[PDB]
């Protein structure tokens, strides 16, 4: 019940009820099984930088997103299970480097290159 | 992280991304038909 049904462009998924020690890479570890995340963001505080217990992940393919919403939902991680829903929010401009720094690590695999830079 | 199975046995033809260590996990939620 955290869906943003305003679109069907909801490649972003709400990952709620996460534990504190769960980081972006962790989320990627479980979610990459269901596809390739092109964007992922862990909702973490701007001061201390600690997880709020929420995340947003976006697969390349929204159908992969759907499979995660269902089949990865209810996976127990450290006493609590994670929740997936179709959320859509506009990425923050203030914290943009967090977003782009994340996709860089993902894009590494996504971009097929014989030559990366000229 | 590595692609273990090269067989698109997945209904969605999705193959595990390069950050999947190789731990197959699923809950088995029947919500999605």
């Amino acid at each position: 019940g955290a869906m943003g049904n305003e679109y069907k462009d909801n490649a972003y998924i709400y990952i709620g009820n996460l534990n504190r020690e769960l980081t972006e890479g962790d989320i990627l570890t479980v979610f990459s099984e269901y596809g390739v995340p092109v964007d992922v963001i862990l909702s973490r505080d701007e001061n201390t930088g600690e997880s709020q217990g929420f995340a947003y992940l976006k697969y390349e393919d929204q159908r992969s997103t759907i499979l995660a919403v269902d089949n990865l939902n209810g996976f127990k991680i450290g006493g609590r299970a994670l929740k997936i829903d179709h959320t859509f929010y506009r990425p923050k401009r203030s914290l943009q480097k967090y977003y782009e720094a994340v996709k860089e690590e993902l894009d590494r695999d996504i971009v097929s290159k014989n030559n990366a830079e000229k | 992280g590595s692609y273990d199975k090269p067989a698109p046995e997945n209904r969605f033809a999705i193959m595990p991304g390069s950050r999947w260590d190789g731990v197959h996990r699923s809950n088995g939620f029947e919500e999605k038909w």
Partner: peptide, 23 residues
């Protein structure tokens, strides 16, 4: 703007130690 570091947060990218036991 800040020229020390971009944002102070930045992503971590690691598995949790929960995960290794939970999966």
């Amino acid at each position: 703007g800040s020229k020390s570091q971009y944002i102070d947060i930045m992503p971590d990218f690691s598995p949790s130690g929960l995960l290794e036991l939970e999966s």
